[PDB]
Amino acid sequence: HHWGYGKHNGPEHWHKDFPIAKGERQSPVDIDTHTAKYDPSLKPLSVSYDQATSLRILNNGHAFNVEFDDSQDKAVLKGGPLDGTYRLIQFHFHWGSLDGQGSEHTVDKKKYAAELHLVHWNTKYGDFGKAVQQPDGLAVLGIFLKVGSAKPGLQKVVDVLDSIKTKGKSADFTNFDPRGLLPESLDYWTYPGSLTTPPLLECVTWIVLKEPISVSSEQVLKFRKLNFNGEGEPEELMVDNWRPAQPLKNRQIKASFK
Ligand SMILES: CCCCNC(=O)c1ccc(Cl)c(S(N)(=O)=O)c1
Ligand code: NA
Ligand SMILES: [Zn+2]
């Protein structure tokens, strides 16, 4: 009886195994755009993904992760609200059963069809597992997806999904360029929060881009053909793998713009 996204093991249950679920800096949150504070001292985000080396794509039973070689200073995020350098380790998505839901963060209560998370760890802690134990261990770049025109740089991901349909499947997945997943603008909101999945550790500086990317109906439909179950087990479509907005508590969301 492990955590997941259903009635009996979904987000409202996670606190029993992971009591930090009711902690002081949980994610995601609703971004109230009128109360976010513009901070003119915030710097442009620096996304340096030219030398990224993707390795593999994995269905972990909760989402799919595209993993990168994080053993050198390739694929780094810096600037913005961050001190120092954070290295890309993986990205994944959260999405809905329907186009009207799927994102984890919300914007003035609006839900997007999906949300991309590019996960980075602070190089001062040497590796991801030590970084998650620190309050400034991770930086996650969150990007909303709306359904409209296709995102051509997403198609390589969608096309490999058939090979990782069920929990535990993985495939070689080299030469994927995550630049093709970014919107034009790097304007962002930022706040201190947590992993949105167990173990829910309170180690993340969230950087949420204001501009969504568009993906096609066909592209998101292929995400919804994945399975939470393993091969040879009864089919449970991988949909609605998002945690709802959590209390803001004693936090301020800052804007890099307007
Ligand atoms: C036990 C791994 C379960 C799947 N969750 C993940 O792989 C995962 C890892 C790190 C982060 Cl920062 C996040 S998120 N959603 O970006 O907060 C998710
Ligand atoms: Na369409
Ligand atoms: Zn995530």
From Swiss-Prot:
Cofactor descriptive note: Zinc. Can also use cobalt(II) with lower efficiency, but not copper(II), nickel(II) and manganese(II).
EC number annotated for this UniProt entry: 4.2.1.1, 4.2.1.69
Impact upon substituting residue 196 to S/V: Reduced activity
Keywords for this protein: Acetylation, Cell membrane, Cytoplasm, Disease variant, Lyase, Membrane, Metal-binding, Osteopetrosis, Phosphoprotein, Zinc
Consequence of substituting residue 60 to L: Reduced activity
Matches recorded under SUPFAM superfamilies: Carbonic anhydrase (SSF51069)
Signal peptide stretch: none
Cellular component, GO annotation: apical part of cell; cytoplasm; cytosol; extracellular exosome; myelin sheath; plasma membrane
Effect upon mutating residue 140 to H: Impaired activity
Effect after changing residue 104 to D: Normal CO(2) hydrase activity
Effect seen on changing residue 196 to A/C/H/P: Strongly reduced activity
Field pH dependence: Optimum pH is 6-8.
Note: Target of drugs used in treatments against glaucoma disorder and breast cancer.
Name of the featured protein: Carbonic anhydrase 2
The organism of origin for this protein: Homo sapiens
